[PDB]
Amino acid sequence: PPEIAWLADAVGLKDA
Amino acid sequence: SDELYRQSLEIISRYLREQATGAKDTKPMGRSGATSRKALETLRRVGDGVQRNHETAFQGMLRKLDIKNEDDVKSLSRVMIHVFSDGVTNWGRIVTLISFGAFVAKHLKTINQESCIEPLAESITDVLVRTKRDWLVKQRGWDGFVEFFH
């Protein structure tokens, strides 16, 4: 999801 | 002599064990226990909603991190400090970070690595204070956190 993309991008999960 | 770190650790650790074990922590509060108690109550409200809202996404992040021991927690600290120094600061990100910490702490309890929970709470705190100290003191610390969410 957009609201946590900043966190999920760092982890590598692309579809947040 | 770091009060902000001390109070922040006390709050974040208690939240993480509570979420991991499913039992509240009746251990008596410290110096500013009034604020810490209400901040912990606030966390139970907003932190549980974040974890519910992003359960599938939190799981996918945890699966890519592959946290099984204390050294994997250290690799998480690297990621946390990088994104919490990107120049964007608001209360929602702080809640999300602690909420994901509670998510990870639940996983550590499931895999019988409860000894890694306290190191996890300390690392989230160290990232929080090192990167957001000046902003936090401007918001009046955990008093502002309590007031912002109710």
Author numbering:
A (entry chain B): 152 to 167
B (entry chain A): 0 to 149
Quote from the publication:
Here we introduce RFpeptides, a denoising diffusion-based pipeline for designing macrocyclic binders against protein targets of interest. We tested 20 or fewer designed macrocycles against each of four diverse proteins and obtained binders with medium to high affinity against all targets. X-ray structures for macrocycle-bound myeloid cell leukemia 1, γ-aminobutyric acid type A receptor-associated protein and RbtA complexes match closely with the computational models, with a Cα root-mean-square deviation < 1.5 Å to the design models. RFpeptides is not limited to generating macrocycles with particular motifs or topologies; the diffusion process generates macrocycles with diverse shapes and sizes and selects the topologies appropriate for the protein being targeted. Among the four targets tested here, binders for MCL1 and MDM2 have helical motifs, binders for GABARAP have a β-sheet topology and binders for RbtA sample looplike conformations that make extensive contacts with the flat surface of this target.
